[PDB]
């Protein structure tokens, strides 16, 4: 009674037969903002099922020489659904998340992925290599949407911080002998009770193969990874025209 899970939120439902468990981030469940903590006087709209539901972004292919990918939140859902219109039409935003990563393979494949949630994953540059240039990353690479961006130097996570110590944040491991899902439930993390979804990204989702995928030819060489994510306890406030960026 642990390797099976049914995540039901809204009009969506994910079944799993080869789960590990559910991680709840920093031991806090997602919630709404108190009256003590709030400052804005406007009454926020709390749409409970039209945005709190599972969305499915795109697929990335785990090849042999794959290095890793990251997805910035909530940039993934600003052009997608009733969530991504309210985020455009409003100035503020506050939601938790339930991330779900799927990678199914046989009992003759092997490999491991680290699926980590790093708050405030600020991106660095190679400084031209020499270290002389104070270069900055482009908007394509800082906020890449739902198609994600691949890491060039995954040992340092493209920020100068090591992959080894990333298990101090939230994480699960997708070991193809043991599991094919990873469920992480994230609360809202910010110094502020509310912030804008289009300028500030609250956290990043790292997917890194620590162990390389291996199979003997004859098997299926195409092993996708699909990110599936639900907002939770979402709140919006400050209504004006729709702006994309």
């Amino acid at each position: 009674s642990d390797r099976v899970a049914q995540l039901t939120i809204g009009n969506s439902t994910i079944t799993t037969q080869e789960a590990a468990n559910i991680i709840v981030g920093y031991g806090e469940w997602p919630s709404y903002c108190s009256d003590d903590d709030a400052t804005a006087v406007d009454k926020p709209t709390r749409p409970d099922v039209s945005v709190n539901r599972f969305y499915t972004l795109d697929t990335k292919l785990w090849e042999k020489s794959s290095k890793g990918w990251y997805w910035k939140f909530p940039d993934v859902l600003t052009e997608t659904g009733v969530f991504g219109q309210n985020a455009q039409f409003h100035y503020l935003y506050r939601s938790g998340f339930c991330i779900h990563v799927q990678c199914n393979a046989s009992k003759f494949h092997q490999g491991a992925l680290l699926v980590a949630i790093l708050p405030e994953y600020v991106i660095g540059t190679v400084a031209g290599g020499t270290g002389t240039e104070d270069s900055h990353p482009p908007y394509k690479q800082t906020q890449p949407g739902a198609d994600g961006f691949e890491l060039q130097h995954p040992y340092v996570l493209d920020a100068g911080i090591p992959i080894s110590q990333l298990t101090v944040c939230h994480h699960q491991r997708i070991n193809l002998r043991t599991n094919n899902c990873a469920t992480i439930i994230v609360p809202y993390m910010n110094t502020l009770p509310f912030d804008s979804a289009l300028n500030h990204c609250n956290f990043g989702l790292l997917v890194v193969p620590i162990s390389p995928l291996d199979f003997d030819q004859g098997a299926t060489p195409v092993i996708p990874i699909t990110i599936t994510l639900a907002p939770m306890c979402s709140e919006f406030a400050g209504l004006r025209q729709a702006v994309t960026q």
């Binding site: 642990d2 559910i22 991680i23």
Partner: protein
């Protein structure tokens, strides 16, 4: 006793033992903190906890 409660821990569960000669509480000493830990928050952050003896995957 008459002094502004204006330190960066006023509104925290932890209580301090400070010295101050001013009315501004942020001028006080660092003091002694409370010895309270929460390793379960980072090390076992699971919805369904499992015991030491229990093999976790049934």
């Amino acid at each position: 006793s008459h002094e502004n409660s204006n330190s960066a821990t006023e509104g925290s569960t932890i209580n301090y033992t400070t010295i101050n000669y001013y009315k501004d509480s942020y001028a006080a000493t660092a003091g002694k903190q409370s010895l309270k830990q929460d390793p379960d928050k980072f090390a076992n952050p699971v919805k369904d906890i499992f015991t030491e003896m229990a093999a976790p995957l049934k």
